[PDB]
Paper text:
In KirBac3.1, the four Leu124 residues form a steric cluster physically occluding the conduction pathway, separating the cavity into upper and lower vestibules, while Tyr132 (at the inner helix bundle) forms a non-occlusive hourglass-shaped portal between lower vestibule and cytosol. Here we present evidence that in Kir channels, a limiting barrier to permeation within the conduction pathway is formed by a collar of branched aliphatic side chains. We show that acyl tails of tightly bound lipids occupying conserved fenestrations into the pore engage individual side chains of the collar, drawing them away from the central conduction pathway and allowing ions to pass.
The mutation was made on a background in which two native cysteines were mutated to serine (C71S-C262S; SCS) and thus we also determined a structure of the KirBac3.1-SCS background crystallised under the same conditions. To cross-validate this experimentally, we mimicked isolated lipid tails using alkyl-methylthiosulfonate (alkyl-MTS) reagents, derivatising a native cysteine residue (Cys119) located near the midpoint of the bilayer at the outer opening to the fenestration on an otherwise cysteine-less background (SCS); the same background as used for L124M. All crystal structures of native KirBac3.1 show the conduction pathway is occluded by a Leu124 cluster, indicative of a favoured low-energy state. In every instance, we observed extended fatty acyl chains of lipids occupying fenestrations near the midpoint of the lipid bilayer, a phenomenon also observed in crystal structures.
Author numbering:
A (entry chain A), B (entry chain A), C (entry chain A), D (entry chain A): 12 to 28, 33 to 297
Write the structure that this text describes.
């Protein structure tokens, strides 16, 4: 079983555990549940105002006396500010509730808009991760590599990548634990990420995987977490993306196929159909 | 008396000291006070428009002449744009005030929405702090430790922790002062914080608490401030959380109980009922 | 003449130089000019719709034929969605313009709200700068110092300070220029800034002002720029503040008076009436 | 052919490749296409409600039976909340659809406002790049230089610049590739960028262009990418700007003309008409 899923999420059951986190819940529920909650409060509030009008008496013009239906639809036309003009308030109290209901309708619109903006304005990075890593010689050193691709034409500014090894380790007190190792990279910051980025960890005598083999990486249940962050121009907003690799997904001796090609016209070109293609000696 | 409270706030009386900071005050007052302020301005503005209409004359259809009540409710139905159709403006001046009032109503809605969004969209980190710290051997060194837990299923990106010692010190000029010491950590940046994080300060010969005891930490009135920051996925927004520990709350020789367990099914599992459990030799 | 003003702004005349920067201009003009611009477009757009209705003919119920006044106020009641019900559209064209005008009114509300939110949500740091700097011995080294104070009860997270020397220098090619020197600080990052912060630059043999005197600092026209940045809890938003000091404003041998006092009750207390008080030997 | 355009964008044809990225597309399409899309959905939704009302029967007051036109305009006056009062719902079903349509109108306004705010609030840095670079002696070292200018009076806080060399290189395994070199700068962070900034890369024995000539830079197809980032005070928001230079655009032996002048009055002054002027020995 893999501790980390391919999407970079955790695979641990949270056994540890309706308005204790209401703001978080309103932003994280599905859209149909969200729209349903908004609708319920919308209807519930009008029903409450309908009861308020009736409690005052027959204070709605052209309304059947004691009718909740008529009072409710008058509440709707008031809170929403439709104000057709057939059902209208009679007397100071009805007109005072109307003054209140209008305020309530504006406040509710502001709240609903605030929540919708927070849910909408959560963009995706649009970044593709290579399905595998490779370990192969680069500049005379065995180098762990993966690569990323921008799926959009807009560029990503101040793009950072973090490659973390997660493996079970034993302390000199005999304590066995999962340790996280930030892997030194040749380039961790790309000021402008536009097309493709080959992320590289030279396995030098300081690397946590120096001397390791495919087999020793399994025995430590070694996994590799990748985090990408950057400022996306399409959104003028920060974005991120995560991914995880198991030891099984390292191609020892592999080489990523070049995704940059030259056309017959001589134009430089990016072919992302080879993004997952790895070359290997047989 | 503790200079810092458990929540990381200061315990100093600010003896040093209604529109001098109005924007800050509108975002920091309680919600009932905020709603009351919005309501007051709402009613006050309509009253001002009611006086404006009356000052022009009897320019409201179906309104009792000289009646503020009728003019006020006509202002309400105009600013809120209900426009039932019984009370309507008569003449160019009343219609000009209506044109103005509608603008005022839109501007006021935009302002109210701006303030509501700023007050709403202030999420909490959802991070739990261990009730105590511990000092115990890790990797052959006495190590000060505390730990954090994510109370939500959504992950926190680029999570930083800062462990600061605050203690009374004396300069070589004889000046006694409170100094803040950033404590070097084994891991200060966790690219993805999902479940639990054990924060560690190896007390090596460079540590400000190297050689200190429980007693010497009291005599210096030593306290420990913790700051957590990160980008929460649930909100696509930055969050933070703070906490403070006294010397009394360091368990010398303690060991945090492991919150990660394996179920009979073999699934890895997180039990946060042991988050505050510390093991100690007796 | 001082190149930098006390507020950290530049004192250089920009001799180098209406819709070339319209978005910037809408956020930077004063509020009365902004409200005036919004009003003008509001009235101008209704006038344009009034002409559109008249161009179709007498298509407004209860409107005097050919009257711009009546058509204009009907546009107002339509765009603002008041819809009293006396002036109403006649025929498909008038009703089509109404369908368009309503859309225009919603789009204009969204635009106006977007601009208002951007102008409103620009908080101030609430940070006070000491009126002077001091140079005095701290930990056995002459140390340039200034200090900051939080004027609010809410804390500022991840607070950074940058102390820059600006002075006229000569290159070994003989070129005279203004150079900026980032001055090393004992603490440049305070994870939680709550009350007061004494910023310190030890003048060691690496300091750009090592060996300088009050007189040599004048001859180089030396100035000191201060930048403060942090995440304010009151706003859950980043804030900043700037300030500048001339050489005249350095008190050689000065010592800032302690703003932390103990009350008769024994409570620790912050007295900001001594924030600008400096002690000097005579 | 230049791999990077002067604006810092990539010049590679993306051969690699309507609701697969709908949120990105709504923010990136032109404004006329955006307004057209909003209009279409606006009209389409009203048409759907018109059909709903007719499907119930003749439930609209003063409406011609079976007329889509009349039902459609009644939908408009309901969703937009105009509510003139001539066309009004008859019976519980029509009034229930009205209750729904009003909600739909509010939700659609919130969505439209959210998208408009995201598209509007994407400010430009207002930063000018010198049309050329220069290599000339500074402080006794040949130094690559370009410079930036603030086109606005508002200052930019925590301004960063990154100067990257891009050139074709060969690995010791014989692999030819484009490598990116972060060029060390004398100043990469200017805490307050107000007027002009001369960015400098001393070509010391560690520089990737140490020993290179104008000719060798061509043979490697060397290009220089510039990224500027900062917090603009006019917007209280982060901004950025990018630019690219070819080897052809380096003036060997050049010196940027000083843009700072003193007036007859003695006031320091900034003349940006000389921003692109370079002095060269002939
Ligand atoms: K309305
Ligand atoms: K409304
Ligand atoms: K309104
Ligand atoms: K209305
Ligand atoms: K009406
Ligand atoms: K409206
Ligand atoms: K809004
Ligand atoms: K908004
Ligand atoms: K916003
Ligand atoms: K925002
Ligand atoms: K009517
Ligand atoms: K509406």
């Amino acid at each position: 079983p893999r501790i980390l899923n391919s999407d970079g999420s955790s695979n641990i059951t949270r056994l540890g555990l309706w308005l204790d986190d209401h703001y978080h819940d309103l932003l994280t529920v599905s859209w149909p549940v969200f729209i349903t909650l908004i609708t319920g409060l919308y209807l519930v509030t009008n029903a409450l105002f309908a009861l308020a009008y009736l409690a005052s008496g027959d204070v709605i013009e052209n309304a059947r006396p004691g009718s909740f239906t008529d009072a409710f639809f008058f509440s709707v036309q008031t809170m929403a500010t439709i104000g057709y003009g057939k059902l209208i308030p009679i007397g100071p109290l009805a007109n005072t509730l109307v003054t209140l209901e209008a305020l309530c309708g504006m406040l509710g619109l502001a709240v609903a808009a605030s929540l919708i903006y927070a849910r909408f304005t959560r963009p995706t990075a649009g970044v593709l991760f290579s399905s595998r890593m490779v370990i192969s010689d680069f500049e005379g050193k065995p180098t762990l590599m993966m690569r990323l691709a921008n799926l959009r034409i807009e560029q990503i500014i101040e793009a950072d990548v973090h490659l973390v090894l997660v493996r079970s380790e034993i302390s000199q007190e005999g304590m066995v634990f999962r340790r996280f190792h930030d892997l030194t990279l040749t380039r961790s910051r790309s000021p402008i990420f536009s097309l493709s980025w080959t992320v590289m960890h030279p396995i030098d005598h300081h690397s946590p995987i120096y001397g390791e083999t495919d087999e020793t990486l399994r025995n430590s249940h070694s996994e590799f977490l990748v985090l990408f962050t950057g400022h996306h121009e399409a959104f003028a907003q920060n974005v991120h993306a995560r991914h995880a690799y198991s030891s099984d997904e390292i191609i020892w001796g592999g080489h990523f196929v070049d995704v940059f090609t030259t056309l017959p016209d001589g134009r430089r070109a990016l072919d992302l159909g080879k993004f997952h293609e790895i070359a290997q000696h047989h």
